[PDB]
Design a protein around this ligand. Structure first.
Ligand code: RTL
Length: 134
């Protein structure tokens, strides 16, 4: 497939508040989250991927094998646990996070020189777009 490795800076973040509200994040944390601009630092070797979502407040780290289900600990976000699987769909990554909230997951892909991420939960869609600094 494709190599997502890079330090990607956020350009776009649409509907993040609604996405966090659907995860039951409290108003205090939503307030500070509202002014963050999380970046993505990704290192990949084939199906082995580390995706670090980096902000000045808190980071969220994923470390997984594409195609292999794992127990995802969402401490720092909503502090839930999911049965999560990230899969290749051509050159896109499709993530399903099974657990309390229905329809939770995300899709990540590169379009030209932009990293696109669509995060989903209970019918809410949050759109994020990132670019490396040339
Ligand atoms: C609310 C909240 C945050 C949410 C991070 C999320 C929702 C990351 C999702 C990452 C994905 C889907 C990576 C695969 O690209 C972070 C922890 C930044 C700071 C503390 C507040």
């Amino acid at each position: 497939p494709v190599d997502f490795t890079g330090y990607w800076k956020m350009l776009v973040n649409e509907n993040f508040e609604e996405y966090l509200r659907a995860l039951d994040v409290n108003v205090a944390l939503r307030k500070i989250a509202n002014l963050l601009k999380p970046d993505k630092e990704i290192v990949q070797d084939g199906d082995h991927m580390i995706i670090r979502t980096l902000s000045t407040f808190r980071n969220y780290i994923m470390d997984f094998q594409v195609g292999k289900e794992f127990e995802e600990d969402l401490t720092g976000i909503d502090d839930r646990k999911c049965m999560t699987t990230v899969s290749w769909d051509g050159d896109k990554l499709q993530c399903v996070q099974k657990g309390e909230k229905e329809g939770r997951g995300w899709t990540q892909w590169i379009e030209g020189d932009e990293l696109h991420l669509e995060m989903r939960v209970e019918g809410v869609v949050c759109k994020q777009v990132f670019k490396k600094v040339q």
